[PDB]
Structures are given as structure tokens and as C-alpha cells.
Amino acid sequence: SAKGIDYDKLIVRFGSSKIDKELINRIERATGQRPHHFLRRGIFFSHRDMNQVLDAYENKKPFYLYTGRGPSSEAMHVGHLIPFIFTKWLQDVFNVPLVIQMTDDEKYLWKDLTLDQAYSYAVENAKDIIACGFDINKTFIFSDLDYMGMSSGFYKNVVKIQKHVTFNQVKGIFGFTDSDCIGKISFPAIQAAPSFSNSFPQIFRDRTDIQCLIPCAIDQDPYFRMTRDVAPRIGYPKPALLHSTFFPALQGAQTKMSASDPNSSIFLTDTAKQIKTKVNKHAFSGGRDTIEEHRQFGGNCDVDVSFMYLTFFLEDDDKLEQIRKDYTSGAMLTGELKKALIEVLQPLIAEHQARRKEVTDEIVKEFMTPRKLSFDFQ
Amino acid sequence: SAKGIDYDKLIVRFGSSKIDKELINRIERATGQRPHHFLRRGIFFSHRDMNQVLDAYENKKPFYLYTGRGPSSEAMHVGHLIPFIFTKWLQDVFNVPLVIQMTDDEKYLWKDLTLDQAYSYAVENAKDIIACGFDINKTFIFSDLDYMGMSSGFYKNVVKIQKHVTFNQVKGIFGFTDSDCIGKISFPAIQAAPSFSNSFPQIFRDRTDIQCLIPCAIDQDPYFRMTRDVAPRIGYPKPALLHSTFFPALQGAQTKMSASDPNSSIFLTDTAKQIKTKVNKHAFSGGRDTIEEHRQFGGNCDVDVSFMYLTFFLEDDDKLEQIRKDYTSGAMLTGELKKALIEVLQPLIAEHQARRKEVTDEIVKEFMTPRKLSFDFQ
16 A cells, blocks of 8 residues: 555544444445445545434434535636535435535625626536536525525524624634635625525525535535534534545645646546646656556555546446556556546546536526425425 | 803814805705704704715705614613604605614624514614604615515625725724624624615615715714725715714713613603603703802803703794793793703603504514605605
8 A cells, every 4th residue: 555645644633533334334224325436435534423414314304415616717627526426426315405505705705806797607607516417406506695685594594603603713713814804704604504404494494403414625624613613502403524535636646726727637627638638747647667667566546646536536346446456566557547537537527518518597597596495304 | 151062173083074054054945944953053063975965966866864773672762862853854854765774683793682582672673763753655674684685785785895894994993802703893884784775676776876864973973984985995975974962961961871870861761750850850950059149140051951952852942042041141940941841851752652652563564674665856
């Protein structure tokens, strides 16, 4: 085994609880379906009170999912799909409604955008997420600047949360200076209120015992720490979490990505030639520099970005293992590994790029219209 | 003339502009009616851009009024009527709509109330203000916790204002510590957004050139300073102001009132016996201690609380002057002055107390329902 990364040491640092095989079988048991490879392969290794989301479900009780998205240049990439892919699965395997927050307000506050430019990006991004194919009959995608003024529960929760979070606390958590507009300072309450059922009357109509499940990155744990700590204090169930590992930066194993450097990740907007070239040229390699050496020494998957990407996007186990075994035994060359991955990414992105182009303004408009929606244990 | 108070020195300090006779005639001129005694007697001595509210009106253009009320124990008193009385007049003499904000959220944040206790007080207070008799066909009385989630303009303005007011600024203005919940820190945007027409689509529906008039106390000027400074920056007309003097505390000329000491002012809830006793026993006197001395020396009205109250509630000029002349010449005794005032307050309070008891939940519910309303230059 190579060095690469360490996630068992984080389970400590953050005080969260690791997702063991017992739990994995538990989900499978209650779901009546085969667990997602993210679980099987340890991509989503940690959690918080999933035991509760389950206790509820196994005891024939509902729960819902929450995901958010801040309107950016829309330069969305491959790593951004991990949480959506997973959440879509959690949704499908449990038949539970999903609320998705488009923080157009957060971006108006942070970026130099107009109020309309922000709402406008929230729409464009909504096309990307809808392309991931979430069941419209159970997914509500909302604009903050829009849904705030058309709900008898949201603001009331914002205010309740707002009273229980001092300024020092958020300073310590988000690091807000005194040069920051009062907008930013208060915002944590906005992205925290969607975690409570009654913030959505046209869905949970007044109900308060419908727990929330939030799949997220492990490092994001401190941020939901605030929301979970206030939950009881305002008479609500803390939202459970599902932690994921970091999605590797194209170059170097575990570097930081961004849209500033167009060569940090493959965008859901790149063509087959771009993906091909990007993977061949930039993906960090965990294989020897000499084919002779690469034959008896082989390569380590644990630091090879390419093989790591397969861990996320290769659906068939036997084939992923095969690549693993052969890349390691030297039998497979680094360029034959890039090829295998390029063969997986091009259709992934062409598929999303295609499936996206089929999103009609009516579909968008529908997805963002508050309304009743069906699901298990209603 | 006695010492008492000085308001021409404040016109300086705050940089506002004094309301001269030219202006007073101007209003009268444009209004086609006799100016309120508050104006005639210098109770509302200062202003900011009233010249603009007028330029608009004289040029056959509309403007609206804004007043607010934070839900308290409802221990409302006589001094609290001054702004409502005036605003009702401004409303009647110009036929312009009036928006009144019940900050139930501000109180949930500041007091140790439940979210429902706050909304509940906002309702009780709405009865008091409605008792002042505002024209329901042109007055909108709203609950913050309620109207936020049923408007396509309010929040958007809150966010716009929120981005343009840094934390240092409000620290410097309201004096917010770091121990304060993020709720309070952001609140200035909430009581500031009602100052812009488009915050009320069901009234000004999208329009942005309908200036706002805010009658207030002179010391409150620094607070609207923030709102007026950001107005242009978000493409809106600064709200004009009408400054009033301080309403004297029962004892001592110009002391601070409150509900903590039930003997600081007469409550709109006291009976005739309470008002009678309160005025005789507590009203500070500007008259000699000896009737012999009080005859040749007389008394000064400028420090006598009682005579000062007459300045606010005695409608007939000739009679107020008569009292003034006689109390000064010694001809009128301090107890005969208290009597004259007690004769003015009892009906004022019995009238409001009566007119209040006639406010039906339907009336309340109606006044707080967003809806279209008629007015001059619509």
C-alpha cells in the first residue's frame, strides 16, 4: 500500500463516527438494495447520527435530504458531481424528498454581482444539477432571494437560528472580520435554516420531527457543527451528516482545485479532446519513469490521480480491481491507465452535457416552484 | 422666557435643516389646509429634504409615510402618540399611504420572548395604533415575522442594504458588541428596508421613485443617517425626515421616561383618577412655592411640565396662550394649570381607550393584510 492519504486520523480530529461494515450492511438491510460504491469503496467513510436517520426509517418513519449550491461562473467540474451523484442515490434507494438551496444571495453579498446576475446564475446552475437527473416529483430546488418571500416558515427559522448564534461564534467558525457587511455576518442562518423540516411548509407543512440528512465533505463538518449545536436549543432534531473524502486535484495526490487554473480538474463543460489531453498531460502518475522499471516495480494506485478517479467513476468492481492489480503488478502501463479513465470520463461528461441541454425553462421553473411532493412514509 | 430647552443648537450638531415659517407656509400652500399645531408651535422644528417631498407633491407626484413600533409590554404612553398623531395628520392633509412596521422580530431577538409571544404583542400594539384612527383604506400595518415571507420585494431590499452596511458602521452607530447574536447585528437592514417603495409591491408595485417621509424624534436622526446614506448607492431616493422635540418626562423638564417607573408619564391605560392624581402629584411645576410670591412673580411655562403638555394636546390656540399669559403673570395658580391639563388628558385617554375597544380581530387582520390601497397622485 502507498502513502497517499489518511482518513482514520480525521475521524478523531473532528470527533465524528466512522462508517463500518456493520452500518453499511445496515443501510443495505433497510434499503433493500445494493449500497453505492462510494460506501463500498470508503469514499463516504464518516457520518453523524445516520444511526438515527435509520432508526427512524427502519421504524417506518420519514427523513429528507439537503444539498446546496452557490451560484458561480458555473465552471462546475467532475469533483462537484460526487455529492449530487451520492444524494441522488440516497434519494432513489430511500424514496425521500430532496431540498437544494441555490444561495444567489450569498453570491450577491460575496461577489461583485447585481441582484439579478446572482438569481440568473442560480438558474444556470439549476440546469447543471437537474442534468444529474434528480426525481422532479420529490426534489425542490430553491432560490434564496426568491423563496424567502414566499414561505411562512423559512424566515421564522432564520430568525430563531439568528438569535442563538453569537457573533464571536461565527467569527471563530467562518472568520468574519469587522470590515464585512452585516449581510455576510448573518448569512450562516440562511444556509442553516433549510436543515429544518418546517422551513418548508409546502412539503413538511408544520411538521418538526422529520430529520434531515446532509451528505457533505468531511472538512465541512465544523460548519454544520453550528447548525447541529443549535438544533435542540430551538426544539429540533440535529441534521445527520455523511462525510466524503476529498476529490483529488488533477495534479499531485490531494491538492486543492479551483476554476482559476483550468488545469486543476476536468470541467463538465470540456470536450472529449480536452478530457483526453487533460488526463494524459496533467493527471499525476503513481507509476515509474522507466517502462523497464514500471514492469518489475509497477505503480501505486494510492497516489496516482487517474486510478483514484476510477475509484469514483468506474461502476464495475471486477474491472476496477483488475486495473488496480495490473497497474500495481506493472502489467498495466501508466498510459493504458489514463486511457481506461479517459474512456470513463468522456461519456460521463458527454452524457451530462447532453442530458443538460434537455432542460427546458419549464422544467427549471417547475423544479423551483414550491409545491407538494410524494415520498416514502408520508 | 425661561431656560428649559434649546433646539436651535441641535439643528447644528446633527447638520439637519430647521423648519422656518417660509416652509410652514409652503406646506400649508401645497396642502390646502391649516398646518398642525405641532408645526405652528415648533414641536416638529427640524427636517431633511421635506423640500423634496414637496417638490414632488407640488409637481403633482406621490410620496408615502413610514412609522414603526416594536412590540413591548404595550405599556404605551401619552408621549408615544405624538408621532402617530402627526403622521395621521400628514396622511390626512396629503392623502398619502402609510406603512407601519411592527418589529416582532426585533423583540424576539432582544427580549426573552417566544416567537409567538412577539407576534402576539405586535397584534396587541396594532390595536393601540389603530385606535389613533388611521384611514384603513391607505394604511398598511405589518408584522416583520409575517410579511417577510409574503413579499417579492422586502427581503431583496434587506439583502441589498445588508451588503452596503459594514459591521464597523453599525457598531459605531448602534454599538453592537461581539457577544450579540447575528440576529441583532443584521436587524438594521430590516427596519431600514421599509423606507423604499418597492419593498411593498402590493402597494407601489415595482415603482422606485416614490419618496418616503419619516416623522421621528430629532435624536433618532443618526439612525436614519445610515438608511439615507445607502439610499443612492442602491439606486433609491433617500427618505426625508421630520424631527420632533423631546416629549417631557412627567417630573423635571426634559427627563427620560420609561415604563419601569409608572410615574414617568401618563399611560394610555390610566383612568381619570390616575391621570388626575398623577398630574397633581408628579408633574414638575414652574411656579413659585408661595401663593403670595406666585402672584407677583408668576411662573415660567418653559420648565413647567404641565404647561408643556398643553403645548402638545391643547388644540385651541387662544386658550393655550391665555393660560400661558396668566400662568406667567401670576394670575393663574399652579393647581389651576394642572386642572386645565387634567381636563385635556382624561378625554384624550378615555377617547383612545374607547376607540381602541372597538377594534375587531377582523379590523386588525384586515389592516395587516397586504393589499392595494388608494391615495392622491396614484
